Amino acid sequence: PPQPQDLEFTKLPNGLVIASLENYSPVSRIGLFIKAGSRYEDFSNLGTTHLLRLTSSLTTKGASSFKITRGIEAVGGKLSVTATRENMAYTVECLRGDVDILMEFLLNVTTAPEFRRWEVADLQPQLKIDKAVAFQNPQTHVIENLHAAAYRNALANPLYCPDYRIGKVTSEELHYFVQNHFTSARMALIGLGVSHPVLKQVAEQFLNMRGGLGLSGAKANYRGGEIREQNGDSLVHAAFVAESAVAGSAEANAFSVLQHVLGAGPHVKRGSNTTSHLHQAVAKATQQPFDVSAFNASYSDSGLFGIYTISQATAAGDVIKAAYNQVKTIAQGNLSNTDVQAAKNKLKAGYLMSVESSECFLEEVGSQALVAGSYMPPSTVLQQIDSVANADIINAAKKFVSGQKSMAASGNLGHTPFVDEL
Amino acid sequence: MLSVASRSGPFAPVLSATSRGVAGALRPLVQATVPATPEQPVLDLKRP
Amino acid sequence: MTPMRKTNPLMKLINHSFIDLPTPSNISAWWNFGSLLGACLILQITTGLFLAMHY
Amino acid sequence: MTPMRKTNPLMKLINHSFIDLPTPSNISAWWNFGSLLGACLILQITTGLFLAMHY
Amino acid sequence: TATFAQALQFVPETQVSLLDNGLRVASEQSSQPTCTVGVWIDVGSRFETEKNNGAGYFLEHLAFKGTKNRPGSALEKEVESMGAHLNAYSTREHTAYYIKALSKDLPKAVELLGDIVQNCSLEDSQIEKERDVILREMQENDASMRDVVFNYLHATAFQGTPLAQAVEGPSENVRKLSRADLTEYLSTHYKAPRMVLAAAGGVEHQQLLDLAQKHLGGIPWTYAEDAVPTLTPCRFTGSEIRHRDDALPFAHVAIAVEGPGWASPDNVALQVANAIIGHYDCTYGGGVHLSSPLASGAVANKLCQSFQTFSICYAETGLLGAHFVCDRMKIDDMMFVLQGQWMRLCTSATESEVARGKNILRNALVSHLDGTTPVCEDIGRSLLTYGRRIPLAEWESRIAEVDASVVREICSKYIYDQCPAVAGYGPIEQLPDYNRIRSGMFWLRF
Amino acid sequence: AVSASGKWLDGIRKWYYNAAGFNKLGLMRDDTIYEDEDVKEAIRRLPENLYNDRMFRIKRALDLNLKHQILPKEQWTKYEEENFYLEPYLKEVIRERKEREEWAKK
Amino acid sequence: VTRFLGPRYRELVKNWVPTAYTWGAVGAVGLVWATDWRLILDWVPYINGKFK
Amino acid sequence: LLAADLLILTWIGGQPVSYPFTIIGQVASVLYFTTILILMPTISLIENKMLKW
Amino acid sequence: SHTDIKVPDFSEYRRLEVLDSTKSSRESSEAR
Ligand SMILES: COC1=C(OC)C(=O)C(C/C=C(\C)CC/C=C(/C)CC/C=C(\C)CC/C=C(\C)CC/C=C(/C)CC/C=C(\C)CC/C=C(/C)CC/C=C(\C)CC/C=C(\C)CCC=C(C)C)=C(C)C1=O
Ligand code: HEM
Ligand code: HEM
Ligand code: HEM
């Protein structure tokens, strides 16, 4: 084998960021990252993104729907559309020898989409199926309510189309969103098996497409409201979030360390998390099945730090009080040094272990390229994560305690507290 | 670190022509099987 | 209370074929010979049966 | 592609009448004399038909 | 720059090395800063009797509850202060304990691993706690429908054989076990040379061998009284099991025919055939009259919700079939189409489909191995299955030998006119009787 | 191109159009085409307004044929005003079928 | 017809040819047996005896 | 025209075998077959051409 | 609890070649 290669970055005059790496794996992977997301919709159009990501297989001006599926299927490759409130990521996988074929489809689907109205109408009922499968897991419904409870305009937009809009999404709205949000400067392209120079000329085709900048959104404002649901399920879910720092900031690192100190993630299977502070606080509060951990969601505009607790309907109040009381003690300055080191080790192991997989590595590179366009190696992550001091964590805890809280809770709710009394 | 796929924040709905759609995130779950009895009943929607 | 020609099996067939059969409104006389053919057959049959009693 | 015996008009009747109509599992040999009667009827026609060619 | 078969030659190979006691040590080195170290044991429910059916599952629950050197919560405190992940799983023919951690902590991981497989404390109070935990977990599994129908398929296809019973075992059996049967099971089974140590990632074979000798070298290799647990072949039975419960939403059929053992070449060709049939779901994009034949027809009358083809392999025997869900009213139609597809493969197989199947198989092999943990699992399972680790180049060579004619002969050998095993759990009033199912395994036109 | 032959071609086509009686009933050319599966799908893709217009004109034609009547001279369809609204949709459907068949043979 | 051509329809015919031959043979023997066709039957080692 | 040809065939059938009837019958028979097998498809395509189908 | 289900013995109905729970059935299927 040859020497370990490095990733090449370049920025075309259009503003597009192109990044490539040359490994020697026999399977090649290509990804397109777009700054478009659910937060860029307004009240006039909603559920557009949720339908848009389902249209990846639809016909284009340069390729038919029949051709795309059959060609990809015969080669044995895949095409997926990951989505989130901030970003949308097209991804394709195949063998080394078939890259030139698949890229032709990928480029087409995002450059020359032809949203046939009859095709869109026939695809509409699929929205219900997708939405139902996601809501099968109650955690999805709790968060989408949580975002709608803590933000007023921008990030409150649901990832899934509202029920009343299912039958009323039009191709004109799809077209309008594409033109104003698929701008070149908003995009980034990543390749793993492909060579950099060929990536330049394959991407040269769409330099006559899009261009400039797109339609900017609105800074997400914080409200602090509650959204209860009162469903018939026996196991009540909840959420206790407060304003946090912004994605990619020094303060954001302190919050990451904070949640891992509170036993955010389980490590050993079929085992109690003794080191976790929250499980210890709850174990002496309830003697029936329970689950607890911390929450952390950082976005470009703002973040949200909080706590999630699955518990019995009767013991919901006690569980929440114990968790909240535990955070107060941390904020009071009672924090040992060993926990800081243990939490940091958990963070670094998680980071490296997550990036270990090629798919996640391509996802992490794309996310970083969009905001900055300059890859930051994991070693630099480690130096940043090791700079955290105890006083920083105490300040982070104090900010969470003093800040206004938003709570979304689905379940029986017979004994669950309210905000302003928690 | 700027990707939420490696965090416990929002979910990441996915779709694929051949693969199935499954959300992610790392907020508490799974570890409730040991202490509890949360059943997994099949319902109107079925996917592997 | 509901019509009795929509329950009895022998009346369901007659209702489908004869009474509530959806038929175009602009069909001309050309579409009548069909029925006549059967009618003529029904005539022949009976006429011949009576001739068979003495042949 | 689904079986043709559930789409062709003539095959729907044959499927309903013979192939797939539910029947009790415990019916005894007494329930076998109905089918025989028709078979005998069939046998009685053909034989008689040939006799009619000479009577 | 590199061709497919040319890139296959840049994959590092695995270095094997035996210890004195007979333990096999394998390793695949790379530049990654992490590693996955685990022990694979050729012990499963296939080696158990009615008195100790649930022993393997029960021990899994007590594996990390404490040991002589690290009593109680000491074991998990050390694991979690390191940031590593400790995991385990069981099967009817294998067991495994593996740890994901940083290469900087390779030494300690092995130590703990050795401690967990030699010095497993079995405190009685813990046994009582696990009794209730297993009792509750069994209730959860009942909720899962797929598990229920796959256990039913084993129960009916291996009637009167040790492979029929499930890993967890009867509920009545788990409430009467003692600290004497578990010790007997542990002493009689967990010992070299059955154990296989594996470590993929940024680990050096030299370091992996010195550490193993330090800790794993003490495992005995001699049975007391020469009570060797010999293995025996398993008979296959063509039968059906029907558990009817109309309150459930969907019918949940499962069918399978007998298939080769893990160590026969034909299985490779069978995998190609399973790629032709493919899998389907309700969330997949497009595909309506646009995908594989069984999935294209799967959406013309909206028959299935999701069907998948499986090929379970054991020593000297295995299961080959297809699992599908369907609505109450469309059970027979889905089975009709599936049987037609199998027969078509047995008689009329074009090379274009075969080429698609081969390409899909290559993608699955390469893509599955991505990541450290899948690599370590492959090393352990292969060393306990074949005695070696088939390299990718060999896999490609064997696949290239596959041809439409080859697929026809092999499918005819295992699929045509063979008695199937059927399992159905749900509203299954429309499921066709065995005789009709058995008559659909051949063609009167052929 | 040929002028006299082209004008003769236009003249004879107009004569044939007038010889066909569907203009006498207000019917457009695309309404008379035999409705095979391809046409059925093409109609399914029409916008609501054209679909509604097509249905009404068919009803009027059927109603007129009922009583053996003829629409007044002034209301007859004219050779130059006709719009081939259904042509683009039918062409796309046929092309898609050809592509499917071409793939299916190899 | 033109769609029926192609590399694979030729392959499908090839696979089914053995079956077609066998079915044709079955019909030919069945016809001879049913009709008691002396012309062919006279060259059968044992059946020929039937004929006086 | 095809209907008239059938009328001629019927009329010829009612007449004895002679020179004029025999030749007329042959012409009617060939005309019958040719019209159905050749003329009808050709004119149908021609009409499709004048309609710019 | 579904793991408590097991097929009752059919030994009084099984054919001779499949009467043993250790011999494979593949060597007699074609014969039967
Ligand atoms: C227990 O569960 C069960 C049920 O509950 C679930 C059931 O419900 C049932 C179903 C119930 C049953 C059967 C019971 C009865 C019920 C029924 C619906 C069926 C009712 C029966 C009938 C109508 C009778 C059907 C027919 C019979 C006998 C046949 C009579 C008619 C015919 C065509 C037969 C054929 C005769 C033939 C060919 C003549 C033989 C002569 C042949 C070769 C020589 C022929 C020659 C010619 C025509 C020559 C012509 C020449 C011409 C013009 C010259 C041309 C010359 C030229 C030059 C051109 C069952 C079985 C069951 O078990
Ligand atoms: C010999 C005795 C026959 C009888 C008793 C009979 C009976 C009928 C009847 C009652 C109708 C309905 C008439 C209508 O709705 O217009 C019909 C329609 C029809 N018949 Fe017959 N018929 C016979 C012979 C024939 C023949 C020889 C043909 C030759 C092709 C034929 C072809 C048709 C067709 C195509 C239709 C449908 C017409 C349409 O859909 O507009 N029939 N038949
Ligand atoms: C479509 C059905 C039928 C047609 C087309 C038909 C036609 C004919 C014709 C043309 C004749 C000769 C007439 C003549 O020579 O003047 C005749 C004679 C006869 N037919 Fe039929 N017939 C039919 C049905 C029947 C039936 C059902 C019977 C039942 C008995 C029958 C019994 C007879 C008899 C007894 C004769 C002798 C005529 C005589 O003695 O003058 N016919 N038939
Ligand atoms: C259920 C149907 C039938 C029954 C029960 C039946 C019964 C009988 C009986 C009891 C006899 C007396 C024969 C004797 O004593 O020798 C007879 C005679 C006769 N039947 Fe049938 N028959 C049937 C159908 C038919 C049919 C369909 C035909 C013709 C199409 C036919 C034609 C004859 C003839 C020609 C004779 C005279 C035979 C003789 O004199 O021996 N029969 N029938």
Side-chain angles (χ1 to χ4, degrees), chain A residues 254-255 258 305 327-332 391-403 405:
Chain A
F255 278 101
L258 174 58
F305 180 93
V327 190
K328 292 185 197 162
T329 49
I330 297 181
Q332 288 294 100
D392 264 3
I393 302 168
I394 305 301
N395 290 284
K398 287 183 180 296
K399 184 180 181 181
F400 170 80
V401 170
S402 297
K405 265 77 160 199

mmCIF file of all heavy atoms in Angstrom, chain A residues 254-255 258 305 327-332 391-403 405:
data_model
loop_
_atom_site.group_PDB
_atom_site.id
_atom_site.type_symbol
_atom_site.label_atom_id
_atom_site.label_comp_id
_atom_site.label_asym_id
_atom_site.label_seq_id
_atom_site.Cartn_x
_atom_site.Cartn_y
_atom_site.Cartn_z
ATOM 1 N N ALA A 254 -18.162 22.879 27.363
ATOM 2 C CA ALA A 254 -18.475 22.687 28.774
ATOM 3 C C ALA A 254 -19.795 21.950 28.945
ATOM 4 O O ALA A 254 -19.917 21.070 29.805
ATOM 5 C CB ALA A 254 -18.515 24.036 29.491
ATOM 6 N N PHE A 255 -20.799 22.295 28.137
ATOM 7 C CA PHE A 255 -22.080 21.604 28.224
ATOM 8 C C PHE A 255 -21.939 20.138 27.833
ATOM 9 O O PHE A 255 -22.592 19.267 28.419
ATOM 10 C CB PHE A 255 -23.117 22.304 27.346
ATOM 11 C CG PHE A 255 -23.758 23.495 28.002
ATOM 12 C CD1 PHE A 255 -23.352 24.779 27.688
ATOM 13 C CD2 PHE A 255 -24.766 23.327 28.936
ATOM 14 C CE1 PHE A 255 -23.938 25.873 28.291
ATOM 15 C CE2 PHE A 255 -25.354 24.417 29.541
ATOM 16 C CZ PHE A 255 -24.940 25.691 29.218
ATOM 17 N N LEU A 258 -20.618 18.465 30.709
ATOM 18 C CA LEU A 258 -21.615 18.449 31.774
ATOM 19 C C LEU A 258 -22.555 17.257 31.633
ATOM 20 O O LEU A 258 -22.822 16.548 32.609
ATOM 21 C CB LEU A 258 -22.400 19.761 31.774
ATOM 22 C CG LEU A 258 -23.583 19.844 32.741
ATOM 23 C CD1 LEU A 258 -23.126 19.615 34.171
ATOM 24 C CD2 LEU A 258 -24.284 21.185 32.615
ATOM 25 N N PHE A 305 -29.850 22.588 26.484
ATOM 26 C CA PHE A 305 -29.391 21.577 27.425
ATOM 27 C C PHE A 305 -30.524 21.227 28.379
ATOM 28 O O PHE A 305 -31.238 22.114 28.855
ATOM 29 C CB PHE A 305 -28.172 22.079 28.205
ATOM 30 C CG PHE A 305 -27.639 21.095 29.205
ATOM 31 C CD1 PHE A 305 -26.621 20.223 28.862
ATOM 32 C CD2 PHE A 305 -28.151 21.044 30.489
ATOM 33 C CE1 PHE A 305 -26.126 19.319 29.779
ATOM 34 C CE2 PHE A 305 -27.661 20.143 31.409
ATOM 35 C CZ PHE A 305 -26.647 19.279 31.053
ATOM 36 N N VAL A 327 -28.718 18.517 39.863
ATOM 37 C CA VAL A 327 -28.061 19.567 39.089
ATOM 38 C C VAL A 327 -27.763 20.772 39.971
ATOM 39 O O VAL A 327 -26.727 21.429 39.817
ATOM 40 C CB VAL A 327 -28.918 19.953 37.871
ATOM 41 C CG1 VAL A 327 -28.132 20.861 36.943
ATOM 42 C CG2 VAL A 327 -29.378 18.710 37.128
ATOM 43 N N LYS A 328 -28.666 21.091 40.901
ATOM 44 C CA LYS A 328 -28.416 22.212 41.802
ATOM 45 C C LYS A 328 -27.151 21.987 42.619
ATOM 46 O O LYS A 328 -26.336 22.902 42.779
ATOM 47 C CB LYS A 328 -29.609 22.429 42.733
ATOM 48 C CG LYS A 328 -30.870 22.924 42.051
ATOM 49 C CD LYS A 328 -31.952 23.224 43.078
ATOM 50 C CE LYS A 328 -33.325 23.328 42.442
ATOM 51 N NZ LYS A 328 -34.413 23.194 43.450
ATOM 52 N N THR A 329 -26.967 20.774 43.143
ATOM 53 C CA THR A 329 -25.777 20.493 43.939
ATOM 54 C C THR A 329 -24.513 20.691 43.115
ATOM 55 O O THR A 329 -23.519 21.237 43.607
ATOM 56 C CB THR A 329 -25.840 19.070 44.494
ATOM 57 O OG1 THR A 329 -26.163 18.154 43.440
ATOM 58 C CG2 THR A 329 -26.892 18.973 45.589
ATOM 59 N N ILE A 330 -24.531 20.253 41.855
ATOM 60 C CA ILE A 330 -23.392 20.489 40.974
ATOM 61 C C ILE A 330 -23.167 21.984 40.795
ATOM 62 O O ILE A 330 -22.032 22.469 40.859
ATOM 63 C CB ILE A 330 -23.611 19.783 39.625
ATOM 64 C CG1 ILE A 330 -23.697 18.270 39.843
ATOM 65 C CG2 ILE A 330 -22.490 20.138 38.656
ATOM 66 C CD1 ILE A 330 -23.878 17.468 38.578
ATOM 67 N N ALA A 331 -24.245 22.738 40.567
ATOM 68 C CA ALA A 331 -24.112 24.177 40.371
ATOM 69 C C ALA A 331 -23.588 24.866 41.623
ATOM 70 O O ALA A 331 -22.934 25.910 41.529
ATOM 71 C CB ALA A 331 -25.455 24.776 39.959
ATOM 72 N N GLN A 332 -23.862 24.303 42.802
ATOM 73 C CA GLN A 332 -23.386 24.893 44.046
ATOM 74 C C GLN A 332 -21.873 24.807 44.196
ATOM 75 O O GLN A 332 -21.325 25.432 45.109
ATOM 76 C CB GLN A 332 -24.057 24.216 45.242
ATOM 77 C CG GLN A 332 -25.521 24.578 45.416
ATOM 78 C CD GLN A 332 -25.720 26.039 45.763
ATOM 79 O OE1 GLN A 332 -26.049 26.854 44.902
ATOM 80 N NE2 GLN A 332 -25.519 26.378 47.031
ATOM 81 N N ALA A 391 -14.347 25.568 36.836
ATOM 82 C CA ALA A 391 -15.165 26.770 36.945
ATOM 83 C C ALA A 391 -16.073 26.933 35.736
ATOM 84 O O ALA A 391 -17.198 27.427 35.866
ATOM 85 C CB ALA A 391 -14.273 28.000 37.109
ATOM 86 N N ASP A 392 -15.607 26.520 34.557
ATOM 87 C CA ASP A 392 -16.446 26.595 33.367
ATOM 88 C C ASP A 392 -17.684 25.723 33.516
ATOM 89 O O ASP A 392 -18.791 26.136 33.153
ATOM 90 C CB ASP A 392 -15.645 26.174 32.136
ATOM 91 C CG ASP A 392 -15.060 27.353 31.384
ATOM 92 O OD1 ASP A 392 -15.227 28.504 31.839
ATOM 93 O OD2 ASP A 392 -14.428 27.125 30.331
ATOM 94 N N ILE A 393 -17.518 24.512 34.048
ATOM 95 C CA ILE A 393 -18.657 23.615 34.214
ATOM 96 C C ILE A 393 -19.617 24.158 35.265
ATOM 97 O O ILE A 393 -20.840 24.051 35.121
ATOM 98 C CB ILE A 393 -18.172 22.198 34.564
ATOM 99 C CG1 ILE A 393 -17.234 21.677 33.473
ATOM 100 C CG2 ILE A 393 -19.358 21.263 34.733
ATOM 101 C CD1 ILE A 393 -16.483 20.429 33.857
ATOM 102 N N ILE A 394 -19.083 24.739 36.341
ATOM 103 C CA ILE A 394 -19.945 25.329 37.361
ATOM 104 C C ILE A 394 -20.740 26.485 36.772
ATOM 105 O O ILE A 394 -21.936 26.641 37.047
ATOM 106 C CB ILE A 394 -19.113 25.779 38.576
ATOM 107 C CG1 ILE A 394 -18.287 24.613 39.126
ATOM 108 C CG2 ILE A 394 -20.019 26.352 39.655
ATOM 109 C CD1 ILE A 394 -19.108 23.425 39.572
ATOM 110 N N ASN A 395 -20.091 27.316 35.953
ATOM 111 C CA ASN A 395 -20.809 28.402 35.295
ATOM 112 C C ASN A 395 -21.890 27.860 34.370
ATOM 113 O O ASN A 395 -22.997 28.408 34.308
ATOM 114 C CB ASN A 395 -19.834 29.285 34.519
ATOM 115 C CG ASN A 395 -18.943 30.103 35.428
ATOM 116 O OD1 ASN A 395 -19.377 31.094 36.013
ATOM 117 N ND2 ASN A 395 -17.686 29.697 35.545
ATOM 118 N N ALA A 396 -21.589 26.785 33.640
ATOM 119 C CA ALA A 396 -22.591 26.188 32.766
ATOM 120 C C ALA A 396 -23.782 25.681 33.565
ATOM 121 O O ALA A 396 -24.936 25.875 33.166
ATOM 122 C CB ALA A 396 -21.971 25.053 31.954
ATOM 123 N N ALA A 397 -23.523 25.015 34.692
ATOM 124 C CA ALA A 397 -24.614 24.524 35.527
ATOM 125 C C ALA A 397 -25.442 25.672 36.089
ATOM 126 O O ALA A 397 -26.676 25.609 36.102
ATOM 127 C CB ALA A 397 -24.058 23.662 36.659
ATOM 128 N N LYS A 398 -24.781 26.734 36.557
ATOM 129 C CA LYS A 398 -25.511 27.878 37.091
ATOM 130 C C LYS A 398 -26.395 28.514 36.028
ATOM 131 O O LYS A 398 -27.532 28.907 36.310
ATOM 132 C CB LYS A 398 -24.537 28.909 37.661
ATOM 133 C CG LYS A 398 -23.888 28.497 38.969
ATOM 134 C CD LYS A 398 -22.989 29.598 39.509
ATOM 135 C CE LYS A 398 -22.332 29.192 40.818
ATOM 136 N NZ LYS A 398 -23.331 28.980 41.904
ATOM 137 N N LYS A 399 -25.891 28.625 34.799
ATOM 138 C CA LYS A 399 -26.692 29.207 33.730
ATOM 139 C C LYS A 399 -27.939 28.374 33.464
ATOM 140 O O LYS A 399 -29.029 28.921 33.264
ATOM 141 C CB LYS A 399 -25.852 29.344 32.461
ATOM 142 C CG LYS A 399 -26.573 30.035 31.318
ATOM 143 C CD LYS A 399 -25.690 30.149 30.089
ATOM 144 C CE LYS A 399 -26.413 30.855 28.953
ATOM 145 N NZ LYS A 399 -25.566 30.965 27.736
ATOM 146 N N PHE A 400 -27.800 27.047 33.458
ATOM 147 C CA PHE A 400 -28.956 26.186 33.235
ATOM 148 C C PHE A 400 -29.989 26.348 34.343
ATOM 149 O O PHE A 400 -31.197 26.358 34.080
ATOM 150 C CB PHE A 400 -28.511 24.728 33.133
ATOM 151 C CG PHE A 400 -29.647 23.745 33.151
ATOM 152 C CD1 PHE A 400 -30.380 23.496 32.006
ATOM 153 C CD2 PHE A 400 -29.985 23.074 34.313
ATOM 154 C CE1 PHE A 400 -31.424 22.596 32.015
ATOM 155 C CE2 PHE A 400 -31.031 22.173 34.328
ATOM 156 C CZ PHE A 400 -31.751 21.934 33.177
ATOM 157 N N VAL A 401 -29.537 26.459 35.593
ATOM 158 C CA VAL A 401 -30.469 26.593 36.709
ATOM 159 C C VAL A 401 -31.216 27.918 36.626
ATOM 160 O O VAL A 401 -32.437 27.973 36.811
ATOM 161 C CB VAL A 401 -29.723 26.454 38.048
ATOM 162 C CG1 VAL A 401 -30.633 26.830 39.205
ATOM 163 C CG2 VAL A 401 -29.206 25.039 38.219
ATOM 164 N N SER A 402 -30.496 29.006 36.348
ATOM 165 C CA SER A 402 -31.116 30.325 36.330
ATOM 166 C C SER A 402 -31.974 30.556 35.093
ATOM 167 O O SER A 402 -32.864 31.411 35.126
ATOM 168 C CB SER A 402 -30.041 31.408 36.415
ATOM 169 O OG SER A 402 -29.340 31.332 37.643
ATOM 170 N N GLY A 403 -31.730 29.825 34.010
ATOM 171 C CA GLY A 403 -32.430 30.092 32.773
ATOM 172 C C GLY A 403 -33.869 29.616 32.794
ATOM 173 O O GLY A 403 -34.270 28.767 33.590
ATOM 174 N N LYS A 405 -37.116 27.625 31.430
ATOM 175 C CA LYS A 405 -37.209 26.234 31.016
ATOM 176 C C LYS A 405 -38.427 25.994 30.137
ATOM 177 O O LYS A 405 -39.466 26.642 30.286
ATOM 178 C CB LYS A 405 -37.278 25.306 32.236
ATOM 179 C CG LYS A 405 -35.933 24.747 32.659
ATOM 180 C CD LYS A 405 -35.119 25.780 33.412
ATOM 181 C CE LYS A 405 -34.032 25.133 34.243
ATOM 182 N NZ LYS A 405 -33.539 26.048 35.304
#
